[PDB]
């Protein structure tokens, strides 16, 4: 389905941008410009995964979630993704909310740990869906 | 309810039509009463508002019932979500239906986060 | 207290938009500085939405049926001018594209907003503060 | 017949109150009470026309209308009104739902371009 | 559910506009424009309550309403509204014909409804907002 | 249409009731229109109490009801009840008295007002 | 019928009121008050006759009288009163309208001619009606 | 307006006729002929006012009266007559309706009260109108 195809290409395109942009990582906890780029491309990864999830929930007639977190819950309850992946992608959404709408409480250590260790929830989602 | 008459009338009257939905009461069991037939359309352009109201009354006369014709391109996000949720697609490609649904549900999810405090206020 | 906070991040975000853009020069060519501008433009738009929605809640102006409707509600109760309501709803539309399908975000419009429409954010916070 | 007579008078009273309340239109889009008044009087005009149509359908034995729109359909099938006048009166039946922000443009449109249809209907009726 | 929510918001907006247009009553009695506004907004309240009732009858699968009034008795039979509130909302169903009676004689009725039955709409939406 | 229910509700709620008429379309079901009922009592009905009683009939009949007080109703409307109405209750003498008074008043009204309706009817 | 009986009684009471007030006739064309009293009791006679007519047309579904005179016309088309008596009663009504509503145009001699020669029309109408 | 002035003159002559015939009142209740004359001229005053009202209703298209009283309601609805005065004239129509349709049920005590205290309700109506 072209919807999934385009969202998947977006997820890969954007996680490469996060990696290129967060290079050695030394210019990260200072320098807000590169923080902005990483946070935006993380949102675009989240939004594309949420669109995939929203699309599948409607087509498989699982219910229409009125929040992005309910959308991943619905895929877990019907066993289209493993629940380990469900709760980690819910964490990404939760971190985007803070990173975009409320940086002044953004830890940024959690961002950097997500940049290095938890991106591998997006690949895992791309691989399951495909 | 004659769905083929609905499809022909809108196809004949709306340029570059893309999606026809029946929604509301007449989809999912039809509710008799004086209730309107609720129809939503997506075309390449926004319809002229007055021309859309005229088209609705022309459908209303053909169907012998009150018709409400909703242009999805200018409709609210709440209303687009209802069409996406309970609507029955009468015409248009499956891909145009999925593009519209994905865009709608995403916009609706962002709206719910934005306005949840207003909804909780007025509901208690 | 929320409005003071939201107004504070709008000013702070407008500042970060202005430095990163600086002189047009090469913003069309390096994607990282567009990401910073685009994100901070989205933050300005979404902070304005939450200002509108806070006012809509405490004054019981109604229930927004779309993100744009948050400013329409303000205009229908004469708390903002309708030319300004229209300009902010134009920002909501760009927000909608940037978050839902970022690749169709035309950049000539992004730079048209950085050049000539950041004032709409400042006019909005100036009106809301004055009330 | 007093029902015909009184309904005609109700239609003309409502038309003049629509013209009077609408005026030039400058304030119409700002005062919700002028809008309410015009809408309510449009609905009264439409209902009075349906009552005339139904009274005529019964008294002259044309048929039994199955809806408000069928009341006018019966009049047109027997050439008591023309098909375009019938179709324009059917359009007005939809106003029953116009009360329940952009349909303000429909109301203005109807005031400017379809008030003549009520007057055309009662002129055809007056000439029996 | 957005239908329930929006209908509740419509009822409150209409109640507020009935109160502010009716005001003290001195000049309600002979300004047909104020009378028309109150009548129409009473009819919107009535229609909005019926739609709420029908939506609940459907989603609670309480039965198919056989009429506008039956929609309320179905709510009362399942104990979601009290019987006197049900009876009071049925009385309001009559208001759809108050404009089309062609006879002051009905305007004493309208002021009666404004002063003693307007609270019935407010009572209904509070009962519903339990959910 | 349940005429016994209409009769019992009016008898139980109107003091010194004299006449009950069904008029309009239901005296001729038809459509979605109101059930039209006319009553004559020794006193005029309170206007608000009459409306409340109409809705009580409306609830019991599950249909819109219009209750008309003949003692305060216009001569035109009284003429319509007299012409097309179906009497549901009351003596035959009280119906005939009401008809004679009504028809006479109407004929005198037609004389006074015939220039007005000629003028209005083009 | 009690309505017929009372209206009959009223016509009789009012004809005697006319004969008694008009007397020999020497003072009628002079005295406004005697004219007023004759004219009023003529009106009452006419209204009592019209009420009888309106009653019978409704009781026997002969039609809806479009006017007080049309009520006599309908009785005549059903052959319950003669066409001559119908026409006389109808011109009585016309004289009543002139006498009451337009006295300045009233020809007082037709009232006298009616008082002398046409009160029998009321009595003829009474006799036919009760001979039912 | 030619018809209005004629009706105004008829009311003034009928008002004087009532005052003349009623006199001091001491014999009004024992002479049926004086009752007839006053009652008749009361009716003429009422019906002349009704014609005046309908002439204005027709000329200004104020509406279609649904009863005789409604003729005065329409002028009060358009602020052309005093609401106190409209109510008084409509009460006078009710008196007329009893006098014309069922004269035996007239209450002479209200007839006297109208002659003594309410004849210039007619006079209020005449002047107001005329000062159009």
Residue numbers in the entry:
A (entry chain G): 2 to 131
B (entry chain F): 4 to 127
C (entry chain H): 3 to 133
D (entry chain I): 2 to 101, 106 to 133
E (entry chain D): 2 to 104, 106 to 133
F (entry chain A): 4 to 31, 34 to 127
G (entry chain B), H (entry chain C): 2 to 133
Text from the published report:
Our subsequent work demonstrated that the HEPN protein with a RX4–6H motif is the toxin which cleaves mRNA in vitro in the HEPN/MNT (SO_3166/SO_3165) TA pair in the model psychrotrophic bacterium Shewanella oneidensis. Furthermore, antitoxin SO_3165 binds to toxin SO_3166 at a rare 2:6 ratio to form a hetero-octamer, and this binding is important for the antitoxin to block the toxicity of the toxin. Specifically, structural and biochemical studies of the HepT/MntA TA pair (SO_3166/SO_3165) in S. oneidensis show that the GSX10DXD motif of antitoxin MntA is responsible for transferring three AMPs to HepT and that Y104 in RX4HXY in HepT is the site that receives three AMPs from MntA. We found here that MntA antitoxin acts as an adenylyltransferase and catalyzes the transfer of three AMP moieties onto toxin HepT to block its toxicity, representing a new type of interaction between the toxin and the antitoxin.
The structural analysis confirmed that HepT was not adenylylated even though Y104 was available for receiving AMP. Similarly, substituting the Asp of GSX10DXD with Glu (GSX10EXE) in MntA also eliminated the modification of HepT in the mutated TA complex (HepT/MntAD39E, D41E). However, our structural analysis clearly showed that the MntAD39E, D41E variant binds to HepT to form a hetero-octamer in a way that is like native MntA. These results collectively suggest that the binding to HepT is not sufficient for MntA to neutralize the toxicity of HepT.
